[PDB]
Structure formats: structure tokens, C-alpha cells
């Protein structure tokens, strides 16, 4: 996020980090319950990647994080990689997340939910802060 | 990328107004936000765009794409969750 600010640790409990076996953060995702994570299809996640829950500072050795293995990758068959349309992938965890104060679910809208232009929302992540 | 989790508030735009920046690349299962002095960027992909509805944070978008330079003046493009939630509910029910 360019121009963002540091979050209060544990305040976005559904935010997870997708890291490869190397320990490299490459994408974010959101827990929708303890066994499922929603992320983008363009992230190109495989079952060798890990979902890290409860993390705030990726450089800390003292945070009680949960490294969760992925059982199956569900890429929306409607995803069009040429247009980057319907960019959603569900990840079924082989090992369920343990919900706590720092790990919980985000709500999903009804297909009929209205989110008006001008509404201030929030986005979070460990992406580049400067490009 | 940063060690610690970053956050940023940003406004949603209408797809019509967003097409002024991206033209026809803006499809129906997409929602734009930003062009407000902040921008999602590489490494943020897959992450959430949440809006508070009736007191609870709900997933409105998924960081999808945008400016190759993460220009804080161009709007970012997110997967519109409202157009994909039926697929999610179907996948979770079958697995």
C-alpha cells in the first residue's frame, strides 16, 4: 500500500499472508471461516504455499502465528486471465485456523448488497509502500 | 515490502467514472477504489477491500490490478465480491 499507515496489530484479524515455502510474502487473503481463505486468482497459489494467520510484523520471531497448509486451490472457472476478470480463488485449508482475538472471519455480502460511490472503505496488506 | 501490516482508507468510485481512467478494461465483476492519494500495490494482491455495513466489516473487493506504478492518482481495481459471492457459496456447499 503506497501512502498507507501501520495498522493496530491484530485489528484486521481476517488478513492472512500467502508465503511460498521460501518464506516469501507474495499475496494477501481473507479468512471467511476457519477452513477457507479467499484470495485473488492472479496470485497463482499452489498447495506448496502457506497461509499465515495472526501475523502483524513479518520480521518478528515472537508472534504466535498459525502457518496453515493448503489442501485444495479453487480457481473460479470464470476467471479470465487475459482480462483479469472474476479474479477470485478459494483456498481450502488442510489444517483449520484456530480463531482467537487476532484470527477471525470477515463478512461476505449478499449478491444484492449496495456499496455506493463515495463510500470510504479500507484496504490492508503487506504490499510495496513505495514503487 | 514492509514488515508490518499497513492499512489505508479510500473511496469507492462508480464503474462509469472509473472507465474514464481505464476505459473498457473495467468489467462488471470489477469495482474501483482509490485515486485518493493512496494505492494498493504489488504484494497486496488477494488482500481485502472492506466496508463497514450495519456495524460489521464486509468484504467488498479483492485487490486485483491497477497502475503498473501504483500511482496514487489512478484508481485501483478490485474483484467485485458481490458478483462472485454466489460462486463462493456454491463452492463451500459442495466441498
Amino acid at each position: 500500500i503506497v501512502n498507507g499507515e501501520e495498522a493496530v496489530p491484530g485489528s484486521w484479524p481476517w488478513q492472512v499472508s500467502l508465503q511460498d515455502k521460501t518464506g516469501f510474502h507474495f499475496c494477501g487473503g481473507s479468512l471467511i471461516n476457519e477452513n477457507w481463505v479467499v484470495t485473488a486468482a492472479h496470485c497463482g497459489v499452489t498447495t506448496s504455499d502457506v497461509v499465515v494467520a495472526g501475523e502483524f510484523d513479518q520480521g518478528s520471531s515472537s508472534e504466535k502465528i498459525q502457518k496453515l497448509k493448503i489442501a485444495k486451490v479453487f480457481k473460479n472457472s470464470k476467471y479470465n486471465s487475459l482480462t483479469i476478470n472474476n479474479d477470485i480463488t478459494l483456498l481450502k485449508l488442510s489444517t483449520a485456523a484456530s480463531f482467537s482475538q487476532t484470527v477471525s472471519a470477515v463478512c461476505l455480502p449478499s449478491a444484492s448488497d449496495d456499496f455506493a460511490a463515495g463510500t470510504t472503505c479500507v484496504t490492508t496488506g503487506w504490499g510495496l509502500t513505495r514503487y | 515490502t514492509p514488515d508490518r501490516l499497513q492499512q489505508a482508507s479510500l473511496p469507492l468510485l462508480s464503474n462509469t467514472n472509473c472507465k474514464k481512467y481505464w476505459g473498457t478494461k473495467i468489467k462488471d465483476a470489477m469495482i474501483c477504489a482509490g485515486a485518493s492519494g493512496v494505492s494498493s500495490c504489488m504484494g497486496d494482491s488477494g488482500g481485502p477491500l472492506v466496508c463497514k455495513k450495519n456495524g460489521a466489516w464486509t468484504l467488498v473487493g479483492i485487490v486485483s490490478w491497477g497502475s503498473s506504478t501504483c500511482s496514487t492518482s489512478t484508481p485501483g481495481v478490485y474483484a467485485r465480491v458481490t458478483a462472485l459471492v454466489n460462486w463462493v457459496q456454491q463452492t463451500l456447499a459442495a466441498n
Binding site: 485489528s11 482475538q101 487476532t102 477471525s104 | -
Partner: peptide, 10 residues
């Protein structure tokens, strides 16, 4: 869902 135990401060 959607209500963190640790309130985000924006």
C-alpha cells in the same frame, strides 16, 4: 463475522 476483538484505529 466482521467485528474484530481488537478495534482498528484509522
Amino acid at each position: 463475522c466482521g467485528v474484530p476483538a481488537i478495534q482498528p484505529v484509522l
